[PDB]
Design a protein around this nucleic acid. Structure first.
Ligand SMILES: [K+]
Ligand SMILES: [K+]
Ligand SMILES: [K+]
Ligand SMILES: [K+]
Ligand SMILES: [K+]
Ligand SMILES: [K+]
Ligand SMILES: [K+]
Ligand SMILES: [K+]
Ligand SMILES: [K+]
Ligand SMILES: [Mg+2]
Ligand SMILES: [Mg+2]
Ligand SMILES: [Mg+2]
Ligand SMILES: [Mg+2]
Ligand SMILES: [Mg+2]
Ligand SMILES: [Mg+2]
Ligand SMILES: [Mg+2]
Ligand SMILES: [Mg+2]
Ligand SMILES: [Mg+2]
Ligand SMILES: [Mg+2]
Ligand SMILES: [Mg+2]
Ligand SMILES: [Mg+2]
Ligand SMILES: [Mg+2]
Ligand SMILES: [Mg+2]
Ligand SMILES: [Mg+2]
Ligand SMILES: [Mg+2]
Ligand SMILES: [Mg+2]
Ligand SMILES: [Mg+2]
Lengths: 260, 186, 146
RNA sequence: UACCUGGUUGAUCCUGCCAGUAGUCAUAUGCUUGUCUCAAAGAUUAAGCCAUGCAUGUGCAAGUAUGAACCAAUGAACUGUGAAACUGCGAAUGGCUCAUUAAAUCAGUUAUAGUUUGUUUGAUGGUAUACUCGGAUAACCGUAGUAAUUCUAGAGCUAAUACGUGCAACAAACCCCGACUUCUGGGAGGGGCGCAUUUAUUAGAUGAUGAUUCAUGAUAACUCGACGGAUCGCACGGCCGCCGGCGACGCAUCAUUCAAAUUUCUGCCCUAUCAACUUUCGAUGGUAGGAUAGGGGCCUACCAUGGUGGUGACGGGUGACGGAGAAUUAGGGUUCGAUUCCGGAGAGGGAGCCUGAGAAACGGCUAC
RNA sequence: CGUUACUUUGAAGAAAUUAGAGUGCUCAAAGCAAGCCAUCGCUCUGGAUACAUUAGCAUGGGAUAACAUCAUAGGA
RNA sequence: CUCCGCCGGCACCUUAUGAGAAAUCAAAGUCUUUGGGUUCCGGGGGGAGUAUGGUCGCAAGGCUGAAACUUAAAGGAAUUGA
RNA sequence: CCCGUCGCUCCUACCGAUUGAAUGGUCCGGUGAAGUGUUCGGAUCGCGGCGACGGCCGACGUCGCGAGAAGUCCAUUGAACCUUAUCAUUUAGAGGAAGGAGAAGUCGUAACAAGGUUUCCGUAGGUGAACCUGCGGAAGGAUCAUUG
C-alpha cells in the first residue's frame, strides 16, 4: 500500500465485537485515539449493536451529533472513537453511566456504575521519565500524559484518575497479592490475585494469577491490570466476578435455569 | 534516481537476485552536497520525508569550533582543508566533510584566552580572578606553535551536507600529534 | 598502536584531551576508556575494559546494543577482519517419514578484539543492528574447543 | 463403509498392468428441466486491444460574497438564504488483476538501544500601527486568439485562516564580562539567555532498562529558523473605560494512536544430462566519509581476501504470486490453492519525477 | 558458573473455513440469532469451546539418545 | 590309524513346527501378530541400453542415459494333454 | 510355434550440411531522450535609495536589495537506439538412417524336442537374412550319479 488503510473488512474485525458474517462487507474501522484499534469497542458498536439506542449507521450519527454521549466526561461526536477498557461512558440525558470492562469470555461489557463511581477511571502507568525542562511526567496505556506524578509511582502501576479534576487521587503499586484483571489473551476478563512474578532478562515477563475459587493461570505483564489493593478491587465487577467457568459448569447453569 | 535498496546487489552466496519490484521513493538517495570551502555561502532547503527539513550546504566559509580543554566555542573562518582520511581528491577540491582536517582562524581563541586568563599567547577583583585562573594554567605548546601562525588545526565534526553547517573541534593531544604526523608525511 | 588507519580512531563522546583527568570516575568520563555491560547475564571481558583497541561495533566498548536473538554455534571461519562465520547445526524434522535430517546455517557475526577465536570454538552471539551487508550479530562469549 | 471386479491359460496358482467401480467449492459440453431457498460467474488462452457512458469530490453558527442572485425587510459596513470562485482537505483508501517473482514474496516468531508517521487522544508553550500592517489575485466584468481541449493571452475591480510582514502581556532564575569598592568578597553597568537547529565540554551518585557516554539538567557558542495566533462563531455579563464565558480553526514539542520501513530465526515444488559460483565494473569483511527518515557495499575512497557450496551453492524449469485454505482422505498420505480474508506486486513495456504526512501514484505529470 | 534432542505444562499461533455448544430460519442447506401470557418491558439474553505441523518463548522431568569432555583431576 | 568332544570352513542328508506363486529354501525361516543396522537397486511389455549431452579410452568401446511413439498383455511356477 | 533380411502403406522420432532462417534475453563497446541535483545566465518583476526635473501622480537618467523565466554547464538516474558475440526459443531443410503399426508378398528355417551343429553370456571377425565361427564363461542341459 501507499499509505494508511481507511477501511476495515468485516471478516478482519476484532472477534470480541461479535459482528455477524453477513451484515456487510465492512466493519467500523476505529479512529485513532486513547486505545488500540484491536483492543477497543467503537462508539457506534456501543450505541447500535449493544445498547440498541440506534438501529443504523446514520442513526448513530444522529445520536452522537446531538452531543448526547460523553466518554470519560467529554463529549465525543466521532462514531469510531476507540472506547476502551475502564472507560466511563455516560449519557447525561437518561442518567446512565457505563464502565467498559471485560467479561470472562474476552468481550467488552457495558457495566452500569453509580454516579459517584463514574467520577473516576483506573489507568495503567506505561512509563515514568523526565520530559522537557527536566519535569517528571507519567504516561498511561490509554494515552494520557500526567506531569508531576507522585515519585512513588512507577511503570506498570495503576492510578486512580478523577475525571472532574484530572488528577491522580490514588494509586496502586504493582505488587504480589494485588487483585488484577487480565485485559489480553485467552484469560481476558479473568480476575485474581498475583501470586508471583517470574522475570526473564531480555524477554516478556510472566505473571502468575490465582482467582478466588483457586484456579491458577499465567499471562504476560502487558496483559495484567491492577484493580485493587489486596483482595478488594477498587471498581465493581460484572456478574461473573471475573471467575471463568468451564463449559461443563456453564451447561450446569443452563440446565438449572431451564429446570427452574 | 539514486536508490538505497538491497535489490540490485548480489546475494551473499554470489547469486543474482531477480527484481520483483520497481524502486520505491522511501528508499531514495540524493546527490551529494559536495560542500566547498568558499566565501560565497549557499545553503539550500531540502524537503525530506515527513515534510521535514535538511540543510544542504554548497559553499561555506565560517564555522562554530570548540576548544574542548578550554571548554570554549567560537565562530571562526575556515581558511583551508588540509587532510581527508577517505580521499585526497576532497583535499584538493577543498571539500568540507565530516572528519576533515581544516585550518581555522585562531584570532577569536586568542582574544578569549587574553580576556579569560590575562595571558597573551584592571581591578583588584579582576586581577584576583585572573591570578586564580593563571595558577595551574597549562598550554601544550603545539596549540601554541600553531597560534604563532594564527591557524588552528581542527576536525569538522558536523555533517555539512545534512545540517548545512561546518562545525567542529580544535585538535588537541594524541589526535593532534597523529594529524601533524600525517600532514608532515604528506 | 591501535592507530592503524588513515584516521585517528577514538571512542565517541570521550574527551581524551581533558585537563582534569581522573581514574575514579565512571567509564567515558575524565578521559577514561568507555565500556558497558551488554546485559543478559554476560560478563564484560577484562581485555575490553583494559584494551587499547577502538571498535565501534564492539558490544562492550562500542556503540552497538545487543537486542533480539541469542544464538549459540561453532566458529566455522575466522579469515575476515573482525568478522567470523558462525555455523549453527540443527535437526530438521521431516513430517512424512517421522525422521530428522541434519541442517546447518552460516551466520556472520562481528567479533571484537577482546576475543581471539579459532575455527571450531563454541561461540555465543547476540543480535545487534545491521553492521554490514550480511552481519547482524556480535560475539558475546567464546569457549575454546579444548 | 479400513471393499474390490473383468481381462494373459486347455485348465491352475502368481507377478503385473489395462479396463471398470466412487468423489471433486472441477471445468467444458450434451440431453432434459415444474416449484423453494442458496449462490459462482472472461482466472486458465491474450498483464491482448478497446467505441461509449459512469467509477472523486467536498460547506459548518464558526476562513473569504456587493452575483448587476433569491426571499424577507426598508438609512443603514456586513439582514438572511446563497450559486460562482479563492482558500482548506481528499483523491496514497477502495476496486481490479496475478505478469514478474523460488529464502525472494509469504507464514509464524523477533527487533528498532536503527527510523518516519497528516490525523486522533493527553500534556506542554515566557527573554522576537498593535483599538490590528502591506501588496496582489480569483470569482465578476469585457477585449480576444485558435479547427480544437477544465487550450490560451491582454485590460478593469475586490477579499482572506491565500500570500507577505510585523509589535509579539510582562518575569524571575542562570551564565559571562565587568567600572568602582575594600576587598578570599561586595558590586553598578553591559552582554547572553523563548522553542527549535548544530557542535563541543560537563553532571546524571551510590529517574529508567536485561543492557546505553540513557531520560534529562548545566554551560559555550551556532543558524541569514516558513516556529512562538494581525483568524472565525455564539453568548454577551461584571466592575466603572477596563475586565469577561462557551467554542471553532491554526503553529510548535513530547507522548499516544493509526501505520510503514527495515529487520532476527525457521520453513518452499521439479531438475546434477546444472559442481562449482561470486569478485575488472561490490563479490566478503574493515576504516573514513557521502547519502537516506533512519541501520547497511546503499554508494565513494583506501585496505584486506574473503563469501556460498553433495546438509546441493550457482544455474535451469514451473501452464509458480505466498498464506489462511480446498478436494479426497481408517490412519499415514496425494493433489490443488487466479478469485471475495491477510501479505505482496502491477496499472501496455521500461525509466524518471512533482505534489504531498504518506506515491517512484498511473481514473497525476515527463520522456522513450 | 556442560549443552541438546525428547517429553510435560503454560502463553501465543487473525477472522473466515473445519470440528463442535446453544438456538424449530415451517424442515434443510443456513444464519447468529433469539426467548418470555403479550411485558411502555424483562432474561446482566446469547453471540461457547476445541483444533492449529514446524520454528520461536517459558515451566517441570532426565528414562532413552546425541555432542563435548572424561589421571599434569595434578582435585579441593 | 581308532574313538569322544570344542571352534572355524566348503558342503551334504532328512524333516516342517516355518516360509513361499510354486519350484524350492534349515534359510529364501523368525512378516498384516508387519520396525536389528546399512549400501545398491525394480515399478506392465516394447521403443532401448537406442538418441542426445557429458565423461573415460589410441581404438574397440565403457560409464551415465531419455523421449516421441506403440501395445493388452509380456512374463514366472506348476498341471493335464499332444 | 516361430526368427530375420528384402518388397509396400502409413505414423513417430533422430542425424543432417546449407556456416538455414525467424523470435526474444545476456556480453562488449558506444550514442543517448527525459527528469533530478549543480554552474553560469538574467527576459522580467517588485521594493526601496541619492539628488534632481515637471505638474500626491507620472516620465527619464542615476544605484542597491530581493525574486526570478528561457537558455546553459557538470554530475546523476537512465528509457531507448546501434554494434560484437553468446544464450533461450521457433525453426525449413536436400539427403541419410532408426523404430512401430498395418496389410501381407518373398527367401530361407535361427529358436522351442538332443529343434535335427544342445541353448545362452562376454568379446572379435565374417556372411542375403535369419545367423556362422574363434577364445573364455554358465546350466537357464540332454548329466544332481562310478569308492571306480
Ligand atoms: K507499503
Ligand atoms: K491529499
Ligand atoms: K514473518
Ligand atoms: K543509512
Ligand atoms: K564500510
Ligand atoms: K496531504
Ligand atoms: K565341522
Ligand atoms: K544354432
Ligand atoms: K537347447
Ligand atoms: Mg487405503
Ligand atoms: Mg488498495
Ligand atoms: Mg543525554
Ligand atoms: Mg558508515
Ligand atoms: Mg505466473
Ligand atoms: Mg491465492
Ligand atoms: Mg496464470
Ligand atoms: Mg474475477
Ligand atoms: Mg488482496
Ligand atoms: Mg503501485
Ligand atoms: Mg491491457
Ligand atoms: Mg507509474
Ligand atoms: Mg483506468
Ligand atoms: Mg488507482
Ligand atoms: Mg515390512
Ligand atoms: Mg517397465
Ligand atoms: Mg533350426
Ligand atoms: Mg541347433
Amino acid at each position: 500500500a501507499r499509505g494508511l488503510k481507511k477501511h476495515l473488512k468485516r471478516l478482519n474485525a476484532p472477534s470480541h465485537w461479535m459482528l455477524d458474517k453477513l451484515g456487510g462487507a465492512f466493519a467500523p474501522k476505529p479512529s485513532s485515539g486513547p486505545h488500540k484499534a484491536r483492543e477497543c469497542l467503537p462508539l457506534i458498536l456501543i450505541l447500535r449493536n449493544r445498547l440498541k439506542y440506534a438501529l443504523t449507521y446514520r442513526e448513530v450519527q444522529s445520536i452522537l451529533m446531538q452531543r448526547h454521549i460523553m466518554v470519560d466526561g467529554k463529549v465525543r461526536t466521532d462514531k469510531t472513537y476507540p472506547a476502551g477498557f475502564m472507560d466511563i461512558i455516560s449519557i447525561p440525558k437518561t442518567g446512565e453511566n457505563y464502565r467498559l470492562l471485560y467479561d470472562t469470555k474476552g468481550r467488552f461489557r457495558l457495566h452500569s456504575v453509580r454516579d459517584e463511581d463514574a467520577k473516576f477511571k483506573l489507568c495503567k502507568v506505561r512509563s515514568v521519565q523526565f520530559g522537557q525542562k527536566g519535569i517528571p511526567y507519567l504516561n498511561t496505556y490509554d494515552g494520557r500524559t500526567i506531569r508531576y506524578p507522585d515519585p512513588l509511582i512507577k511503570a506498570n502501576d495503576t492510578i486512580k484518575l478523577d475525571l472532574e479534576t484530572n488528577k491522580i487521587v490514588d494509586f496502586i503499586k504493582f505488587d504480589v497479592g494485588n487483585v488484577v484483571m487480565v485485559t489480553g489473551g485467552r484469560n481476558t476478563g479473568r480476575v485474581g490475585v498475583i501470586k508471583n512474578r517470574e522475570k526473564h532478562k531480555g524477554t516478556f515477563e510472566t505473571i502468575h494469577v490465582e482467582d478466588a475459587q483457586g484456579h491458577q493461570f499465567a499471562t504476560r505483564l502487558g496483559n495484567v491490570f491492577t484493580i485493587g489493593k489486596g483482595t478488594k478491587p477498587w471498581v465493581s465487577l460484572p456478574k461473573g466476578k471475573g471467575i471463568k467457568l468451564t463449559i461443563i459448569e456453564e451447561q450446569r447453569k443452563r440446565d438449572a435455569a431451564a429446570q427452574a | 534516481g539514486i536508490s538505497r535498496d538491497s535489490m540490485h546487489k548480489r546475494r551473499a552466496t554470489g547469486g543474482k537476485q531477480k527484481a520483483w519490484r520497481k524502486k520505491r521513493k522511501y528508499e531514495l538517495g540524493r546527490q551529494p552536497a559536495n560542500t566547498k570551502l568558499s566565501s560565497n555561502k549557499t545553503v539550500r532547503r531540502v524537503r525530506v520525508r515527513g515534510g521535514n527539513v535538511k540543510w544542504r550546504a554548497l559553499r561555506l566559509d565560517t564555522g562554530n569550533f570548540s576548544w574542548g580543554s578550554e571548554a570554549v566555542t567560537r565562530k571562526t573562518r575556515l581558511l583551508d582543508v588540509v587532510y581527508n582520511s577517505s580521499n585526497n581528491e576532497l583535499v584538493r577540491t577543498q571539500t568540507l566533510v565530516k572528519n576533515a582536517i581544516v585550518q581555522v582562524d585562531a584570532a577569536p581563541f586568542k582574544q578569549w584566552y587574553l580576556t579569560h586568563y590575562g595571558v597573551e599567547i584592571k581591578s583588584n577583583n579582576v586581577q584576583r580572578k585572573l591570578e586564580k585562573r593563571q595558577q595551574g594554567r597549562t598550554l601544550d605548546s603545539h596549540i601554541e606553535e600553531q597560534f604563532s601562525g594564527g591557524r588552528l588545526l581542527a576536525c569538522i565534526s558536523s555533517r555539512p551536507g545534512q545540517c548545512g553547517r561546518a562545525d567542529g573541534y580544535i585538535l588537541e593531544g594524541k589526535e593532534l600529534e597523529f594529524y601533524m604526523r600525517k600532514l608532515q608525511k604528506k | 598502536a591501535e592507530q592503524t588507519e588513515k584516521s585517528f580512531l577514538k571512542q565517541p563522546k570521550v574527551f581524551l584531551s581533558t585537563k582534569k583527568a581522573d581514574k575514579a570516575k565512571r567509564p567515558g568520563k575524565a578521559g577514561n576508556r568507555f565500556w558497558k555491560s551488554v546485559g543478559l547475564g554476560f560478563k564484560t571481558p577484562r581485555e575490553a575494559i583494559d584494551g587499547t583497541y577502538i571498535d565501534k561495533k564492539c558490544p562492550f566498548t562500542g556503540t552497538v546494543a545487543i537486542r533480539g536473538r541469542i544464538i549459540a554455534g561453532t566458529c566455522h571461519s575466522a579469515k575476515m577482519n573482525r568478522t567470523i562465520i558462525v555455523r549453527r547445526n540443527y535437526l530438521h524434522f521431516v513430517k512424512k517419514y517421522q525422521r530428522y535430517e541434519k541442517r546447518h546455517s552460516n551466520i556472520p557475526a562481528h567479533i571484537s578484539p577482546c576475543f581471539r577465536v579459532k575455527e571450531g570454538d563454541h561461540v555465543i552471539i547476540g543480535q545487534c543492528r545491521p553492521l554490514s551487508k550480511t552481519v547482524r550479530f556480535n560475539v558475546l562469549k567464546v569457549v575454546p574447543a579444548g
